[PDB]
Write a protein that binds this ligand. Structure first.
Ligand code: HEC
Length: 100
């Protein structure tokens, strides 16, 4: 279950906040976020528990952060409730590996 064309319609839930193409806006640019540090865009103003995490966004840490953002980063400035199916986050993770 890694379909990148289905991850474009799931990324329509993200793309009012997050762009990919340099702009930022409400959330940062996600252009290769799979394998980037937590708090990893030099320019965007991040929250305290996002900066105190560090490390990396793996295709596994993103799979439970994209369904409960406040369970993995407790007190994030990301105003997002969660994705429901494991196919929704796995298809989006397959999209923004290639589409960046
Ligand atoms: C606007 C209401 C948002 C929606 C909808 C989504 N996200 Fe977002 N994202 C937003 C903000 C304000 C932030 C920054 C949080 C902070 O600490 O200041 C974020 C952050 C993410 C991140 C972390 C990126 C990093 O540089 O470490 C990820 C990985 C992220 N958001 C992913 C993401 C996806 C894929 C969404 C759609 C399913 C999504 N966000 C929605 C704001 C908003």
């Amino acid at each position: 279950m890694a379909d990148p064309a289905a991850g474009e319609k799931v990324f329509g839930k993200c793309k009012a906040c997050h762009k990919l193409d340099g702009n930022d806006g409400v959330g940062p640019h996600l252009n290769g976020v799979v394998g980037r540090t937590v708090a990893g865009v030099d320019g965007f103003n991040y929250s305290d528990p996002m900066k105190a995490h560090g490390g990396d966004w793996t295709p596994e840490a993103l799979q439970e952060f994209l369904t409960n953002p406040k369970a993995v980063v407790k007190g994030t400035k990301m105003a997002f409730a969660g994705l429901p199916k494991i196919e929704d986050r796995a298809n989006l993770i397959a999209y923004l590996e290639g589409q960046q």
